[PDB]
Amino acid sequence: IAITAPSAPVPPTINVVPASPSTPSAPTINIGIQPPSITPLSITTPDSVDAPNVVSPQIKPVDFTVDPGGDSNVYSSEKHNSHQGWKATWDKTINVTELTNRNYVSLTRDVVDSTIPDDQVINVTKPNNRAMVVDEVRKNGIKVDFKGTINLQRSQNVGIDLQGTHQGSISTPLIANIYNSGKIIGNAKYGSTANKEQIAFGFNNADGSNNTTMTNMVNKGEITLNAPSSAGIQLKPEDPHDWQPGAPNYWNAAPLQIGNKTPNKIKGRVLMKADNQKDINLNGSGSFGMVTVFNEGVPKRLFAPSYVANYENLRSERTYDGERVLPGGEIGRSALSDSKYTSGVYNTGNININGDSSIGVGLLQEIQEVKLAGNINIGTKAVAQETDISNLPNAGSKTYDKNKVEEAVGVFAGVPTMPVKPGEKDTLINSSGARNTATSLVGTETVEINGNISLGEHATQSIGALVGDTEIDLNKGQLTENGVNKGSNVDRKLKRSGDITAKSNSVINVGGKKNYGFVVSNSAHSSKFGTTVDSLEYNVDKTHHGKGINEGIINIIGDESVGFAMIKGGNSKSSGTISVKDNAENSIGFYGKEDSFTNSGTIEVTSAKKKNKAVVLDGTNASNKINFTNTGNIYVNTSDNNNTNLDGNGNIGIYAQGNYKVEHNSGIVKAGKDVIAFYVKDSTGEVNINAPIELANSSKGTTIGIYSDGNAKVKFGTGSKLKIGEKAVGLYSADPTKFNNTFKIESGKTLDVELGKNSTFGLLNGNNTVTNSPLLSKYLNNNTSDKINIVSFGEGASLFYATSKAKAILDEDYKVTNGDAISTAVLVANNGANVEIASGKKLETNTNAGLIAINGTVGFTSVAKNNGTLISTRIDKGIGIYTSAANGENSGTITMQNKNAVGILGSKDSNLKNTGKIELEAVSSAGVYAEDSNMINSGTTSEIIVNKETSVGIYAKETSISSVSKNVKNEGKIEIKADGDGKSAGIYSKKEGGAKLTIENTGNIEVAQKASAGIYAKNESTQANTQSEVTNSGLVKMSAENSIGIMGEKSKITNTGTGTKGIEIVEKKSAGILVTNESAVINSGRISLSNSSISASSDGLVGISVDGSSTGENDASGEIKVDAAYSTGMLSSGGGITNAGKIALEKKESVGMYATNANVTNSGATPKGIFIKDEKSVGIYSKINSSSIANKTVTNSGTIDIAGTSKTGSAGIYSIIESGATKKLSVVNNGNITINQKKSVGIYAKNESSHANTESDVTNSGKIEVKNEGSAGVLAEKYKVTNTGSGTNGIIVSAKKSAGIIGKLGSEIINSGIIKTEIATPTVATDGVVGISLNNSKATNTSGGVITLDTDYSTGMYGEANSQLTNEGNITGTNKEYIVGMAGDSSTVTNKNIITLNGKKATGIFGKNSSTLLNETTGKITTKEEESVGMYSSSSLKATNKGTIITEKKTSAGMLGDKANIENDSSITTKEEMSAGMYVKNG
């Protein structure tokens, strides 16, 4: 009968206020690029010389004189012909015998001129004779024309001859003109006997004749000689000793005996002139056509043993009666100035030389004049060479040819010509020594030719014009050579050498094979006589004798023939052209070895043909100590200074091997154009250059003083003033494998060279044959002054030029402080070559560009490796190295100083390999730059560093040019130790094409300046986040707050990171993944930031942040790890957010999903979603402020979980609106949200003012798992709560002492759905459940929500501390006893709605603790179960009742007393059985 009631426990309150982080700002970016254009230089390619062996055949004596037998005793013109000249009638078969028998026809002392008609044929039967002799015919100008046929058969025979006369006068020399139209032939065989010394015409005499004798001969017939060593026309000076026959017998004795010598002033000085006016054909070998023999006197045949003892030969200077005749012989001086008294040699006809090793025209004694204007042909007639026909049996030596003529010579010079000078005193000498004079110059100074001298096609290494010596012995006489009198002792040799001059009228048409055009094989033997008899003085004189004076054209119609070839002799004066008439090959002009010959003339290649070389200067062949004392006139192939032609190419100035050097030390030297002075070979050749040079600007090609294939010991030294202007090149090379040792440079030998424009140190191709890379690190090496300094440049020039698979190394440091404009870059790699940058190299620059690489023919992979310190300091756009179709590699340090500087750049489908360290200490600069190519960072030593703001690291662009994917790879560490709050980035990606780009980082990236991040990409156009997507398997770390982690456009990311891999952020305000244009992420890996000391309020971070153009979402395997306090996983701004992975919360004051001005979505469910572990936090929380314009909300369709049997201090759903902000922030629940923690709240919203709460909205269309005791469903302060859950959705309150709905003062409590208590009956009394609880506030139950009570002793609404409770909603509860909905403790209660209940002894209202009730009748209670009462009073001094009670159920009562005694006066109808309104529990 003692009915009591329990008491509800006190509910908790929560105040969680998490952090308010912010979104960081992406930095601005982008830098331009400039490409350089290289200068289009020129090329030249020489080669070497094979074998210019100059074998010079020697001269041989031709002393083949016949005895002057005089008249005959059977046909004397006096006793048999009556002095009427030639007798017209004779026998056609006269058998002429030798001179001893005198069977020859003789004609002497005639007054009638006679000749021979055509019909004659005469042979010779014996040697040493004349078929017929026409002697002593002065006749003062005889003139006839011979027409008979003459034949030669034995040796020492004469075809026909007309000799001079002993009668004449000094002032009127004789004039002659003889014609000879006949045929003369000298054959090669006499049975089986050899034939030689057969002479056609000539001059010879034993006894003296008249000096004033002057004669002329005109050739008119056919001349043929087939005996080897024959003689066409012979000229001789007469003996000044004037040897005489055996007087008084004289010429009667047979053979002649020379019986006396009569030297005299006016004896032995005759004059002679010869002329060929027809065809001379020489078939014999080693012969003479027209030669001036040496005046040796006579062979010993006329020297009897009685007179061999007093054999005083012309082997000494000869003086008689006061004469001063030079040793060896002399032709007298002429003063009557006319060509008809000019005694010498001249020709107009033709000479046909075909015998092997023969002489065209020979000079053996000094004569008055030698000028030649005829046809000198050697080897132009094909003949089958045979023994004693045109060759001789070999003497164990060189074999003579059968079809070609070899060792043949044309002009032979062993002595010069000595004409009459204007001051010269003539030889017009009277008997008493009375002598005339001359007032002018007659004849040319030396050997002269004005006619065509030609070598035939059969000419093989034959000689055109030979300047040789003449080695003749001498008697016991005085000797003097370059010093004191020798007093004999040293051998006495007739040292004689001649000199030749030529004119363009004399075309030297040398032809055939390797023929020796004009070889000065002499020794320049210039000889003079002293003040006494037998006096001789010798020197190397370059004025008097033995020189080379060239003025004429030397026509090289054959191939690889040589002209002026130098074995010995010293100097010569060159002023005439030597040219190749055709496309002949390897023609060499100068084979020089000795004293400085002077080139006072041009020597070039005036033809399209090339590969023929100019001058070979090497060690002296036949004189001591390589006499290259070259300081004379050196004027070759240049554009000025005594040589104004530069035509052709392949011209050389120096060619040498072995013992050679150059010694230019005085005067002036002028270098050629498109010609190279130096080119040498082998491995031991040294060069000395110390003379200052003068240069003119280079030609269409390129000019350089020095070149070699890389194999010379060329040296530089101070003193040689060097200069360049306008498109020349300092160092030229086509073969760098050996070039490394070419130029040794010694300290202090700094060379001063100044340059114009379009120039370059290194021109290199390598000929695709670079076996060895030249270690070129010496020319401006930093160690010592063993450098070369060529600094004076204009603008538009380069340093090194690499083509054709060449290779070279930057020396050390070199700079060109002469312009940063176009065509001024350090070096260019062309045709796909490779160059190496050694470590420690310091090619600093201020110019336009550094290294440029471009591929032509591939050959070898286009790549250059950097190991040195490469820095640029150009004022604007200083680019370090560039590659096109070429791979860039570095392993050293690269920095930069000035603005807009650029490091390594690649393009055109290549890759970039980084191994070195790059630091960005400058501004407005990018280290590695790329476009339409690949790249990679190789190894952790590949270090990318930034030291200042306004600079970016990796830069790669893509386009529509190639639609194949590229890649951006990193294996090194990118630690950015920069400054400033931003303005710096590490890796940057661009695209405009239709392809896709792969970007992955496996190495490390770090940033130490604020507001900066490494990854950032351009993927703006219409595509998903998988084309320029960035995936990470590397490490993303940081060192400065306010910064950013992941940045970019349209990318998909995974956290492939374990250990020291992934993303690590330990400081403030540095978001992990901020995204633009819809980027997604896989969060399976390390997001362990370890920030804010996980318990300290010192930092604040965000895992992933999003913008309006993006929706941030996590992979289903995503593991978003809260390793920091006051941090966040999801930051949302404008765009959308959705979770598909796992989102935990391990640290304090964090949030998985935080949203600003954006909507919140969850799809991750079963078993995905949000799983909160730590406390003082909420899984998802979004807030907006007065400044927030976006009307956004929060949605739930996933799993949000936090649980705890001892954890508390948190809430399920959180969202705040700041006071005064009418922005309508709301939350909707439709997912799973477990609240199994202690004292938590499913949905929380905080208020700051009593404003109109229509903006804040709280609806629960989903489910809340209230299974943990003591917690609360939802709390709010002056906000609107709508219980929109129905059935298993919404208010699932299933815990003991737990609370469904509680509100603060003036809270808008609304019920519009299910309100179902815990189904489980309490395990102990008073352990019921409460739905509504109040504390000095107001609550509004609404009938729109159904309130269901199933826990025993549970309550629907609860109130305390003067709380005013308003009831308007439905009340339901069944299957349990008591379960009073209304329990009150010290409060004012008003009832408005009618209450219904089920269960035994169910009661609607229960009052406790001095509580009082107004007792409104409308708040009545409907009784459904038996023994149920409506009112309950317990421990209440105040009680008011003014209404009747209607009972309609059995055992049901009205008023009920509890442990008290109060009496009143009221009556209530008890019409039903046992249904009365009153009963008492106390007696």
Residue numbers in the entry: 290 to 1772
From the paper:
A pivotal pathogenic factor, the autotransporter adhesin Fap2, facilitates association to cancer and immune cells via the receptors Gal-GalNAc and TIGIT, respectively, leading to deactivation of immune cells. Fap2 is a type Va autotransporter OM protein and with about 400 kDa the largest single protein in Fn35. Structural analysis of the Fap2-ECD by cryogenic electron microscopy (cryo-EM) in combination with AlphaFold2 structure prediction reveals a 47 nm long rod-shaped β-helix with a matchstick-like tip that interacts with the immune cell receptor TIGIT and the CRC cell receptor Gal-GalNAc at two different sites. Thereby, Fap2 simultaneously acts as a molecular spear that deactivates NK cells via TIGIT interaction and as a molecular grappling hook that anchors the bacteria to the tumor.
